[PDB]
Design a protein around this ligand. Structure first.
Ligand SMILES: *Cc1c(COP(=O)(O)O)cnc(C)c1O
Ligand SMILES: *Cc1c(COP(=O)(O)O)cnc(C)c1O
Lengths: 368, 368
C-alpha cells in the first residue's frame, strides 16, 4: 500500500493516472454535454474501475456503458445502475442478463438481429420488468444499416410486438470509424454522417409510429469535437476521453496536457555497443498496440529524443548516438502509451496521483 | 466453478488447456533432458501457474525460472524452491530479492553489469547465505558478450572478489534469437553458435581458474530439436513448450497436435452484406500478437477456410464467399493463438480439460 508515496518510488513498470487530469477530463465532457443539452453515458472500458466510473459519472453512480458481463456485474455490485451493456446481447448468457435486469432498476441491452429478439421473448424477465432494448445501428463493425428496410421492421418489432415484455428504449450507434481518420474535420464528417443517419432513422421511426424516445451515439474523437447537430440527440456515450492517449493525441482529439495515463518504467541497463537503453517495461506492461514496428507503441514523455525500438515480454529497448549520462540506471521515465484501453488491461492496479504524490489505487475487473 | 462441464458449455471467450497435451509436453521435455544427461529448469512465464509449474517440474516443485518478482513470490508462497529469477537482477528492488533469498534454500539471480555486483555487495544477505549469481551471456537482447574481455573480468569478480557473500553459480544464455528464423536447421545453428560460445567461455573460465560449475541455455525452439553439443551443458531452461502455439507451429518446433492452448469463442452474429462471421473473441482475449495485419493472430482450429480479419477489444470478424449454415449462431470455434505467452496473460482463469470435459481451473498471477 502506497498512499502519499512519491512517484519515482513506485515498483515499475507501473501504470499511473493523474487524478487532476482525469477529473478535469470528466468534468470537461460533462460540460460539453450540458452545453449541447444532452445526457452523458460514459463507457467504462478504458479503466473498468469503480473509482473511474465514479469520476465519469460525476459522483452519481448512474448511467454508464460496459463491454462485458463482468463489468456489468462489478458495477452492479458497486452500487451503479442504469447500466447499458453496449454489445449485441449475448444470447448464450441470458440467464445472467436476466439476473442483472432483475437486480437493477435499469439494465439496458442492445441487439441487431431478429433472432435475438426471439431469444429474449423466450426468456421473459417476469416481475413486471421489461427487457430494455436498444437497436444498434450500423452507420461499420456491427448493427443494422438504417436504410435497410429490415432495420425498420426490427425496430417495429422490438417496440411493439410484445410491449409487456420488451421495450425499445432508443437507437444506438458507435461512430468508431473515426479511428482511421486524421484531423478534426474528418472526425466531424464521420460524426455528421452518423448523426444524420441516426436522425433520419428516428424521423422514419416517428413517421411509421414506432415510439423511440432516445438516441445515443459517440466516441472519444467525435465527442472531443462535438458538432451542433448532436444536440438533436438525447445521449452521447464516449469513454476513453477520461484518460486519452498517444493515438488520441495523433488524431487531434486532445493536446498532450490532456493525457492522464503513463506507464512509469526504469532504466535498468545501458548498452553502449548497440547505443541502447534498457527499460523494465516490456509488452506485459504496455501491450503491442500501435505497432502493426514498436516505435509507435509509446512515446517517452519529456523526451522526443528517444524512441521505443524493441519490446519483449518484460523489457523494452530505447534509442536516441546516445547520452547515457543523462539517463543513469535507476532513473525513471514515463511512457505515453498509444491505446489507453489496451495498456489499462495489462494492469491489476493503477497508481492514481496528485502533485507527484500517490493519492489512490484503483483495481479494475477483468475477464468475461 | 465448472468441474466436469462440457467444453462448448463454458462462457466464452475462454482460454483452454488440454491437460493431456500439456502433461505430454512436460514429460517429453523431461525425457529429452534425461536423454542429454542434463537438468531441466522450466521457465514459467507462459502460464504463471502453480499447476503449470507442477507439471513442468514433474511433481517436484523445485528448479524453475521466473520473469518477475511477482512470480518469484507466488511460486515461493506455493512451496517451490530453487527458483531462478531469469532477469538482470533489479537493483531498485533489492530488499525484495534479499527477502526471497532468505526464505529460500536456493534463489538465483542474474546480472550482466559490474555495478549490479556493487549493489549486491552493499546489500549483503547475512545469515551465512550468499547471493547465488549467474552471469547472463549475450551470445542479442541483454547480457555480456563472451569475447568482450569485460565478461571474463566480471565472472572473475562474481566468483572470487567476495566468496563469503556472493558466488557464481554458472553462466546463463537465452538463445531467443531463434524466433526470427524459420525451419529446424537455422534454429539448430543458433543453438550451436550459442552452445559453442557458452562452452568456449567456460573453457576460458577454467583456464583462468574461475570456478563455474553450471552452464544453462535454452528456448523452446532449440530445446524442441536439441543438438548433441548440448549435453556438455548442465541445464536447459525452455518454458513455452508446455503449451506451444501457432508461431511455434510455423517455426517447426512442434506439430499442431502438440499445441495445448486454444481460445474458445462463439459465433454471435452473421453479416451476409460483408460476408463475415462475428465472434466474441476480441483482443482482450487474444492479444495483438502476430499482427505486426490480424490474419495471423490466430487460426480457426479445424477450419483452414476461415481467417481472422478484424479485432476490436471484445470482437473478432471472420471471413471465408461464406457458408453461414455451417456456422449457426451459438456454435463454438476454437482459436489457435499465435503467441501462447501473450494470450495467456489476458486470462484470469484457464479451463483445463481431458476428453472434452473440464478437469481443472488454474489461476495465474500477474503484475510486478
Ligand atoms: C468502447 C466503446 C464505446 C466508447 O467509445 P470510445 O471512442 O472508446 O471512447 C462506445 N460504444 C461501444 C460499443 C464501445 O465498444
Ligand atoms: C521466456 C524466457 C525463457 C524461456 O524461453 P522460451 O523460448 O519462451 O520457452 C528463458 N530465458 C529467459 C530470460 C526468458 O525470458
Amino acid at each position: 500500500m502506497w498512499l502519499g508515496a512519491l512517484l519515482d518510488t513506485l515498483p515499475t513498470p507501473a501504470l499511473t493516472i493523474d487524478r487532476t487530469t482525469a477529473r478535469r477530463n470528466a468534468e470537461r465532457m460533462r460540460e460539453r454535454c450540458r452545453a449541447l443539452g444532452v445526457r452523458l453515458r460514459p463507457h467504462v472500458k478504458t479503466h473498468k474501475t469503480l473509482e473511474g466510473g465514479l469520476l465519469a459519472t460525476g459522483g452519481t453512480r448512474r448511467g454508464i456503458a460496459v463491454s462485458t458481463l463482468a463489468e456489468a456485474r462489478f458495477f452492479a455490485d458497486g452500487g451503479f445502475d442504469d447500466i447499458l451493456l453496449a454489445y449485441p446481447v449475448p444470447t448464450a448468457r441470458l440467464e445472467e442478463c436476466a439476473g442483472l435486469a432483475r437486480r437493477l432498476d435499469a439494465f439496458h441491452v442492445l441487439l441487431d438481429r431478429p433472432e435475438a429478439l426471439a431469444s429474449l421473448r423466450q426468456r421473459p424477465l417476469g416481475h413486471g420488468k421489461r427487457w430494455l432494448v436498444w437497436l444498434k445501428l450500423d452507420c461499420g463493425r456491427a448493427g443494422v444499416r438504417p436504410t435497410d428496410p429490415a432495420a425498420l421492421e426490427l425496430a417495429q418489432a422490438i417496440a411493439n410486438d410484445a410491449p409487456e415484455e420488451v421495450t425499445l428504449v432508443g437507437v444506438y450507434a458507435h461512430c468508431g470509424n473515426t479511428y482511421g481518420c486524421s484531423g478534426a474535420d474528418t472526425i466531424q464528417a464521420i460524426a455528421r454522417t452518423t448523426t444524420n443517419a441516426v436522425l433520419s432513422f428516428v424521423a422514419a421511426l416517428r413517421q411509421a409510429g414506432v415510439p423511440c424516445p432516445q438516441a445515443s451515439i459517440g466516441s472519444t474523437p467525435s465527442c472531443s469535437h462535438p458538432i451542433p447537430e448532436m444536440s438533436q440527440l438525447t445521449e452521447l456515450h464516449p469513454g476513453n476521453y477520461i484518460f486519452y492517449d498517444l493515438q488520441q493525441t495523433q488524431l487531434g482529439s486532445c493536446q498532450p496536457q490532456d493525457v492522464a495515463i503513463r506507464v512509469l518504467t526504469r532504466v535498468i541497463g545501458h548498452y553502449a555497443h548497440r547505443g541502447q537503453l534498457l527499460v523494465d517495461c516490456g509488452w506485459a506492461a504496455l501491450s503491442l498496440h500501435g505497432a502493426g514496428g514498436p516505435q509507435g507503441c509509446a512515446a517517452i514523455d519529456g523526451h522526443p529524443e528517444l524512441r521505443l525500438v524493441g519490446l519483449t515480454q518484460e523489457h523494452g529497448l530505447l534509442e536516441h548516438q546516445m547520452d547515457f549520462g543523462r539517463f543513469p540506471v535507476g532513473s525513471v521515465l514515463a511512457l505515453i502509451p498509444y491505446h489507453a484501453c489496451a495498456t489499462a488491461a495489462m494492469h491489476p492496479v493503477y497508481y492514481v496521483h496528485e502533485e507527484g504524490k500517490v493519492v489512490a489505487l484503483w483495481h479494475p475487473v477483468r475477464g468475461w
